[PDB]
Write a protein that binds this DNA or RNA. Structure first.
Length: 68
DNA sequence: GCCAACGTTGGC
DNA sequence: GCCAACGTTGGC
């Protein structure tokens, strides 16, 4: 399920999807959803949308935490 | 050797 | 044409 990510602005949720098939079966991808449902797949994609709203330079994309 | 990042595939 | 799932690799 999509769980709230406190490091990001209110309404931002993150979800982790285990791959089901193929040679990378078992690995996982992380996605974020904006307050309005829009899907982000990488830290630079989040960065382009959020801009000056929050400094994502210490943001660990995979876990959803600022790692100082 | 690993994986972030994002192109490509397959199904719709 | 859209998009979720998977392949792929340059940079580390």
């Amino acid at each position: 399920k999509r769980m709230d990510c406190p490091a990001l602005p209110p309404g931002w949720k993150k979800e982790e999807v285990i791959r089901k098939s193929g040679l990378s079966a078992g690995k996982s991808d992380v996605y974020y959803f904006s307050p309005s449902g829009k899907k982000f797949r990488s830290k630079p994609q989040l960065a382009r949308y959020l801009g000056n709203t929050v400094d994502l330079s210490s943001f660990d994309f995979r876990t959803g935490k600022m790692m100082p």
